[PDB]
């Protein structure tokens, strides 16, 4: 009885928002600078006034507006045109109104209140790719996702040993080379120079812009998403992707991983992954 | 042995069939469950049951403990689709040691998993034990490990390992498909009997669903197939039309066995299942708050015949399967309109378990109001209703339900009428009913006739000295 | 007394058609 | 934040030993869909036996941790190396 009337003492006392998140953070991973907070109503600078300004800090490592290892010029050095493919600095964007208004290429996804940095090493789009290597996964003899009704997916992600997430090759225009060669930013450490038709057997998923944290107003990373699917679970197509994995001079690991909303990559691939998952009816 | 009655339902499915959607072969080719017609028969152009599907003696006639989930035993019988219902009922009573039950609970609903409010969990999982504890019931369920049939297996596990009482051993009979089972292999034995095992595996076996752990008995039906889900519907409704047809035997003069559904989740097909029960005259109960179609029929429960043409209450299913009123990919919603408008018309045969104003009554009493509500609706030629509900009221051992329901109307006194029921509680014992009848003027100086004692001493306790 | 406080645990959880 | 499978219902229970909050172990991380696999509770059943913490053992015995399967040869060898050091 004494435990039950104590249960009655307590019983009667009862009478565009989706433009940027990761680019709008405070810390940017090399130099301790943050100078402009912009909320979800002042993001598109073409709409509101925003008379208050972010002060600038550019090029992140070597030479502030010279960028001789990086590859872009000064604002007094007559900034190259907005949607021109020329030259080796690929400034050919994917969106139309790539705006060079202030003598410098301001971004089209609204102001993130940042500098003009060479974290991209490029005052522009940096059209990159992600080889979404895709095992429509298995069990002892072929499986689906019983969790809802859907299909369960397996994706190779590489854990780089220094940065604490699990990523994919960023085909972000290898300097002097093309986009399928910063595909080999990490894939040169997968040891094969033989097979080179990786995106030639690829399927396009999503062209557009990513919420990269290392963006700014004058440098922002839009991309193309490319899937390389596998429906056999059986033979030479997965085998030539697996037997061409020595990974001899690699850092940590490249292990096959299942997909969900809870994988250890933080932001960029994770907001990109479900668009690949939507095309094949996957679970995400 | 009783093996020579339950029969196979086996035949090749790869005589010739281009069902190459599964990539492992064409369509379950040889070295499979297909084993007999591996030589050349006549043509095999179309396997359909014109092309005969054999019935040989069975190979799953045993008893398997879940390794290593539990320790108790449970019976394993596969059965054909054309097996007569009296055969399995003889198999349950005379060979599995099962008592003739006093009511049937046919829990139906959606196959997919679902999570509701924990107040509904603490009411429904508690009271469903408190039905089968007192009455000694059977719980006909849907078999496998996913969905509403999973949630009822939670409730038995919530009792029979916490308050693990031999007194009131609950009997939940799982009826599923031998063919949607996840490990058909590892369970076959033409030997005939086995105290064998298998291992549960949930995350594998993508299409073939695995068996639920907490069940007392397993009955598996088949059409020589695999992957095709609904094949036990023409067995469970054909079985339950016989168990509701079969009568009790007891010395207190016997009854017909009643029958009730419980719907939790619902969905398409379940709406076809509910009115098919009520057309045959078996009442059932819908729970509030949880359910795709269940909360729909809960919402249109008390409204009269004035129909939306459902489109306002199309998307009251809280999951939004097909996500919209208009992209529901179900043309002719007028089909589901008639199924609702027939259910709500029969006011007697349908009740609804409201959470707020009926849960404090009980979910015990509401599931036993409904059987009493149906039998009140159907009596013939006089005061047999207040004889028939009391005939049930012996076999419930629910004294308050006998008191608070069928002793508050105008009881037609005639206390010779209580004599075939006073004889029941004395033999069955059941002592608490005797004070109830002595309250109602059953005079013992008039009741004890000469012939009643002669019937009484022939029904002693047989184990007594 | 023990049967009566159990009655108070459950007492405070209450907050043409004719064709 | 869990990574690669059912480590969350391993990680929250790993915390749930060190709380000695039995109801929070019961009412929170035993009401979802617990992935059964009762070898998974063996690095946690070993915790409550050494720490003692006796009230968790009834909770795991409710969840089908079968003692006839759990007590391996090597577990006792790990168990007797972790006695109460002040004991006789």
Curated annotation (Swiss-Prot), chain A:
Q: Where, per UniProt, does this protein localize?
A: Cell membrane; Perikaryon; Cell projection; Cytoplasmic vesicle
Q: What is the effect of changing residue 214 to A?
A: Abolishes channel activation in response to ADP-ribose/Ca(2+)
| Binding residue positions for ADP-D-ribose 2 | 162-163, 212, 214, 266, 268
Taken from the record's topology, the Cytoplasmic segments are 1-284
Q: Which domain of life is it from?
A: Eukaryota
- Reported impact of residue 181 to Q: No effect on channel activity
- Domain topic, free-text comment: Contains two binding sites for ADP-ribose, one in the N-terminal part of the channel and the other in the C-terminal nudix hydrolase domain. Both sites seem to have a role in channel opening, but the interaction of ADP-ribose with the N-terminal site is absolutely required for channel activation.
**Subunit annotation:** Homotetramer. Isoform 1 can interact with isoform 3. This interaction decreases Ca(2+) influx through isoform 1 and suppresses susceptibility to oxidative stress-induced cell death.
Question: By what name is this protein known?
Answer: Transient receptor potential cation channel subfamily M member 2
């Amino acid at each position: 009885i004494s435990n039950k009337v104590d249960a009655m003492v307590d019983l009667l006392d009862l009478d565009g928002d989706s433009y940027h998140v990761n680019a709008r953070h405070l810390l940017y991973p090399n130099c301790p600078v943050t100078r402009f907070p912009v909320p979800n109503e002042k993001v598109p600078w073409e709409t509101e006034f925003l008379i208050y300004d972010p002060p600038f800090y550019t090029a992140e490592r070597k030479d502030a507006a010279a960028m001789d290892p990086m590859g872009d010029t000064l604002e007094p050095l007559s900034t190259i045109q907005y949607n021109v493919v020329d030259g080796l600095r690929d400034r050919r964007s994917f969106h139309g109104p790539y705006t060079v208004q202030a003598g410098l290429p301001l971004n089209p996804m609204g102001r993130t209140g940042l500098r003009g940095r060479g974290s991209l090493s490029c005052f522009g789009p940096n059209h990159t790719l992600y080889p979404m290597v895709t095992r429509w996964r298995r069990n002892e003899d072929g499986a689906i996702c019983r969790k809802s009704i859907k299909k369960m997916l397996e994706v190779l992600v590489v854990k780089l040993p220094l940065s604490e997430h699990w990523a994919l090759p960023g085909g972000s225009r290898e300097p002097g080379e093309m986009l399928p060669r910063k595909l080999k930013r990490i894939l040169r450490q997968e040891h094969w120079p033989s097979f080179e038709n990786l995106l030639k057997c690829g399927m396009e998923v999503y062209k557009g812009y990513m919420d990269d944290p290392r963006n700014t107003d004058n440098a922002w990373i839009e991309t193309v998403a490319v899937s390389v699917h596998f429906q056999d679970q059986n033979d030479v197509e997965l085998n030539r992707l697996n037997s061409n994995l020595h990974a001899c001079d690699s850092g940590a690991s490249i292990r096959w991983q299942v997909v969900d909303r809870r994988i250890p990559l933080y932001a960029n691939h994770k907001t990109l992954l479900q668009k690949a998952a939507a095309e094949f009816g996957a679970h995400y | 042995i009783k093996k020579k009655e339950c029969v196979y339902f086996v035949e090749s499915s790869k005589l010739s069939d281009a069902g190459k959607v599964v990539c492992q072969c064409g369509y379950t080719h040889e070295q499979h469950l297909e084993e007999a017609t591996k030589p050349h028969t006549f043509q095999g152009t179309q396997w359909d049951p014109k092309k005969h599907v054999q019935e040989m003696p069975t190979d799953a006639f045993g008893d398997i403990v879940f390794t290593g989930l539990s320790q108790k035993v449970k019976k394993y019988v596969r059965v054909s689709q054309d097996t007569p219902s009296s055969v399995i009922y003889h198999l349950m009573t005379q060979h599995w040691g099962l008592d003739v039950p006093n009511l049937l609970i046919s829990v139906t609903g959606g196959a997919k998993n679902f999570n509701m409010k924990p107040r509904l969990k603490s009411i429904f999982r508690r009271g469903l034990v408190k039905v089968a504890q007192t009455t000694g019931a059977w719980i006909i369920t849907g078999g496998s490990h996913t969905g509403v049939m999973k949630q009822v297996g939670e409730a038995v596990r919530d009792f029979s390992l916490s308050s693990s009482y031999k007194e009131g051993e609950l009997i939940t009979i799982g009826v599923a498909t031998w063919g949607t089972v996840h490990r058909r292999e590892g369970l076959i034995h033409p030997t005939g009997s086995f105290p064998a095992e298998y291992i549960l595996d949930e995350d594998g076996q993508g299409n073939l669903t695995c068996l639920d752990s907490n069940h007392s008995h397993f009955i598996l039906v088949d059409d020589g197939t695999h992957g095709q889900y609904g094949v036990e519907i023409p067995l469970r409704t054909r079985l339950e039309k016989f168990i509701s047809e079969q009568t009790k035997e007891r010395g207190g003069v016997a009854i017909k066995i009643p029958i009730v559904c419980v719907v939790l989740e619902g969905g398409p097909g379940t709406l076809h299942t509910i009115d098919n029960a009520t057309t045959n005259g078996t009442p059932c109960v819908v729970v509030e708050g949880s359910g795709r179609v269940a909360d729909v029929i809960a919402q249109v429960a008390n409204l009269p015949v004035s129909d939306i043409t459902i489109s306002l209450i199309q998307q009251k299913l809280s999951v939004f399967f097909q996500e919209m009123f208009e992209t529901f990919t179900e043309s002719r919603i007028v089909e589901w309109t008639k199924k609702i408008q027939d259910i709500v018309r029969r006011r007697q045969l349908l009740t609804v378990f409201r959470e707020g104003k009926d849960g404090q009554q009980d979910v015990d009493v509401a599931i036993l109001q409904a059987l009493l509500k149906a039998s009140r609706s159907q009596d013939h030629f006089g005061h047999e209703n207040w004889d028939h509900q009391l005939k049930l009221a012996v076999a419930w051992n629910r004294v308050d339900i006998a008191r608070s329901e069928i002793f508050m109307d105008e009881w037609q006194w005639k206390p010779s009428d209580l004599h075939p029921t006073m004889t029941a509680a004395l033999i069955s014992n059941k002592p608490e009913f005797v004070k109830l009848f002595l309250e109602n003027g059953v005079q013992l100086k008039e009741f004890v006739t000469w012939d009643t004692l002669l019937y009484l001493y022939e029904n002693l306790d047989p184990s007594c000295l």
